[PDB]
Amino acid sequence: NAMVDKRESYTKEDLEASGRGELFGAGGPPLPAGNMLMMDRIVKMIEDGGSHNKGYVEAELDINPDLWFFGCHFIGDPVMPGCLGLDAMWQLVGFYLGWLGGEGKGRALGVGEVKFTGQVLPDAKKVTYRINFKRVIMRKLIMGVADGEVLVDGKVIYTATDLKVGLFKDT
Amino acid sequence: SNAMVDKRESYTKEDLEASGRGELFGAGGPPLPAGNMLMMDRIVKMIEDGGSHNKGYVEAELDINPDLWFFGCHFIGDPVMPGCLGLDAMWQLVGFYLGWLGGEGKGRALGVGEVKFTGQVLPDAKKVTYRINFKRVIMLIMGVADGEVLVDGKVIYTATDLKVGLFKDT
């Protein structure tokens, strides 16, 4: 919890290093790698920023027509699964806890209401994730609670209330 | 409504693969996803008047082995099935049930009310079970349901108010 002079943005290379457990300390929570990594860059991180003044992170995914999920979901009718945008938000909550200096391995613990009101199609350009923290709890289990939004090409299409993620010392 | 439905009480992996190709409910009904987004291997039970609200009960299974694609990438050093993929399995089953009843269109998950994860699927697990209890079926075709995910017989996720619609024009 003594970590200061924090970076406010991260590149794709940084996100891949995180997947290897090589961005933060070896004890920090890694992002998923490969086909489960659902963003290309983190554009903004602010401690005590965001809609509740308790933390903010903004990230982006470039929507390339060759993204793996388009081919299989659904065949000949490509659309990004909402569940993967939801996971992207969970991953960002966990990442933010690690960014503060939290040690452990991340596990999504749940979410309140999730609404999918639009779709991400291959013809889209960019998905944006906006995460607004409500609670940061530095206990034996480090826990983050946040509200999230997913935008496609600048318009909000998903909302999630009370995303919850924990960092476990031992799973 | 879609009259071209192959309506049975259980479905095999071949049936699920056929569904991904649109061969179970035909041109007018909702296909399942395929490949690495298909999150079950069979549907064990479908009961039209069954479940908590006497509106539908569906049970399905995913066989677990250490080589499933998601284990390798989520996370390196700490393989665990993403909860979101079990949620998707349940959303897909809600859409599938709508099609099974003759619903016309392509499925789209609309959201969920509340989700609690109290456990995890590790690569040394053997079976994941999905249990879906339908609460509302509107035949604007949509379904509202509660779902549970178990691993090796133990409940690890609950999801209330899973919602899916069928859209003739996505």
From Swiss-Prot, chain B:
It is found in: Cytoplasm. Gene3D superfamilies: Hotdog Thioesterase. Necessary for the introduction of cis unsaturation into fatty acids. Catalyzes the dehydration of (3R)-3-hydroxydecanoyl-ACP to E-(2)-decenoyl-ACP and then its isomerization to Z-(3)-decenoyl-ACP. Can catalyze the dehydratase reaction for beta-hydroxyacyl-ACPs with saturated chain lengths up to 16:0, being most active on intermediate chain length. This is 3-hydroxydecanoyl-[acyl-carrier-protein] dehydratase. It catalyses: a (3R)-hydroxyacyl-[ACP] = a (2E)-enoyl-[ACP] + H2O; (3R)-hydroxydecanoyl-[ACP] = (2E)-decenoyl-[ACP] + H2O; (2E)-decenoyl-[ACP] = (3Z)-decenoyl-[ACP]. One of its GO terms (biological process) is unsaturated fatty acid biosynthetic process. One of its GO terms (molecular function) is trans-2-decenoyl-acyl-carrier-protein isomerase activity. The active site is at 74. One of its GO terms (cellular component) is cytoplasm. Homodimer. Pathway: Lipid metabolism; fatty acid biosynthesis. Keywords: Cytoplasm, Fatty acid biosynthesis, Fatty acid metabolism, Isomerase, Lipid biosynthesis, Lipid metabolism, Lyase. Belongs to the thioester dehydratase family. FabA subfamily. Its main location: cytoplasm. Its EC number is 4.2.1.59, 5.3.3.14. It comes from Yersinia pseudotuberculosis serotype I (strain IP32953). InterPro entries: FabA, FabA_FabZ, HotDog_dom_sf. It holds the Pfam family FabA. HAMAP family: FabA. It comes from the Bacteria.
